Each structure stands twice: as C-alpha cells, then as structure tokens.
C-alpha cells in the first residue's frame, strides 16, 4: 500500500489514557469518564478508567444536548461547574435516572477548546460518594487537560504551518 509505516503517527486511543490514567492517579478519583465532541454535539467514550466493581463505558455516545447547547458559548470562555452532591443540582427526571444507574455521585466539568473549538471535554465523577473539588484541582486539571489539546493540536496541523519554525 504505502512505504509510511504506522510508527510515524501515535495512537489516539493511547494519549486518552495518560489524561484519564493521571487524573485517577494524581488526584486518586474513583471514577472519571472523558469522550471527545462531536459535529452533532454528541460526545464519544473513546476512553474510560474506572475502579473495579464499576460499570465501564467506553465506545459510548452521550447525548446531553442540555449544557453542550447553551453552555457551550460559556464553555468556550472556560468556564466550569462543580456539584459535590448531585442531589441539590438537576432535580431532573431523566438525569437522575440516568446517573442513577451509574451512581454517579459529583458533578466536574472542565472545558477543552482547540483553535477556540470544543473539541472534548474532561468529566470527573465520585462514584463512592460526594467529592469537592478544591480550586487547586481545577487548575491541575485545565493544565492537565490543556496539555491533551497539544497532542490532538499537533496532529489536526503539522504537514504545513510554519516553515520558518
Ligand atoms: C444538563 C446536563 N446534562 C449533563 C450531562 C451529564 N452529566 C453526567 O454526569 C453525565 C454522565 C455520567 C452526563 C451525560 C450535564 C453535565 C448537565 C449540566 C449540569 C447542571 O447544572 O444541570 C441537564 N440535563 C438534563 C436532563 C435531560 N437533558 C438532557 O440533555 C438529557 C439527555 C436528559 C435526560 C433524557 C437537564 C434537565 C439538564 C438541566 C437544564 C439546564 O439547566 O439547561
């Protein structure tokens, strides 16, 4: 086919799992799910790390078309929202129902914008109990998460952008 041999590109699959592999470790979450955005803001599992006894996703589409529609525009400034007991926040039907399986009990959203696009975004969950995310962690997790748009920056331009260097 081609004389190109795969070791010249990295597997996209691999670089997901230092992000959710770190946030587990560093942090010692019990539970964290991260899926990439879509066209049809429709997230994608392309990768999950969850303690054992847990249900694991992965190749899971979520459809939340509640905050990825309005809060997007708010996302794209950076903006977060953290609920340590999901039970005061989304009072909800379908939500509840929808965590409830999961039990899902937190609520960690940090935005993840490439080019000034929202290419993913990094979800952390507690499924044992609650958890507040001190402000700290935030910034651990934009610089954590900031360092996954490197990656995927790289790979979107690299052919042609800057031959002066
Ligand atoms: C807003 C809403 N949805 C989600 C999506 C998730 N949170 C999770 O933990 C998970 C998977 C484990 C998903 C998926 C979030 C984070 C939020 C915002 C948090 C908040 O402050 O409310 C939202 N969802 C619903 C229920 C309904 N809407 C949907 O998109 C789907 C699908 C539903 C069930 C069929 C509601 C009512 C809201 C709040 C509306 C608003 O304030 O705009």
Same mark, same amino acid.
């Given at each position: 086919?081609?004389?190109?041999?795969?070791?010249?590109?990295?597997?996209?699959?691999?670089?997901?799992?230092?992000?959710?592999?770190?946030?587990?470790?560093?942090?010692?979450?019990?539970? =964290?799910?991260?899926?990439?955005? $879509? %066209?049809?803001?429709? &997230?994608?599992?392309? /990768?999950?790390?969850?303690? +054992?006894?847990?249900?694991?996703?992965?190749?899971?589409?979520?459809?939340?078309?509640?905050?990825?529609?309005?809060?997007?525009?708010?996302?794209?400034?950076?903006?977060?929202?953290?609920?340590?007991?999901?039970?005061?926040?989304?009072?909800?039907?379908?939500?509840?129902?929808?965590?409830?399986?999961?039990?899902?009990?937190?609520?960690? =959203?940090?935005?993840?914008?490439? $080019? %000034?696009?929202?290419? &993913?975004?990094?979800? /952390?969950?507690?499924?044992? +109990?609650?958890?507040?995310?001190?402000?700290?962690?935030?910034?651990?997790?934009?610089?954590?998460?900031?360092?996954?748009?490197?990656?995927?920056?790289?790979?979107?331009?690299?052919?042609?952008?800057?031959?002066?260097?």
């Amino acid at each position: 086919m081609a004389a190109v041999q795969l070791s010249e590109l990295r597997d996209r699959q691999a670089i997901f799992e230092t992000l959710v592999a770190k946030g587990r470790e560093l942090l010692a979450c019990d539970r =964290v799910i991260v899926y990439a955005f $879509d %066209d049809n803001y429709v &997230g994608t599992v392309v /990768a999950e790390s969850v303690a +054992e006894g847990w249900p694991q996703a992965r190749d899971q589409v979520i459809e939340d078309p509640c905050f990825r529609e309005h809060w997007v525009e708010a996302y794209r400034q950076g903006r977060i929202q953290a609920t340590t007991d999901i039970f005061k926040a989304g009072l909800t039907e379908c939500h509840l129902n929808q965590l409830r399986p999961l039990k899902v009990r937190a609520n960690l =959203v940090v935005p993840m914008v490439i $080019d %000034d696009q929202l290419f &993913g975004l990094l979800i /952390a969950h507690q499924a044992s +109990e609650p958890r507040q995310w001190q402000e700290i962690e935030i910034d651990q997790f934009s610089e954590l998460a900031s360092t996954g748009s490197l990656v995927l920056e790289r790979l979107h331009f690299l052919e042609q952008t800057i031959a002066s260097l």
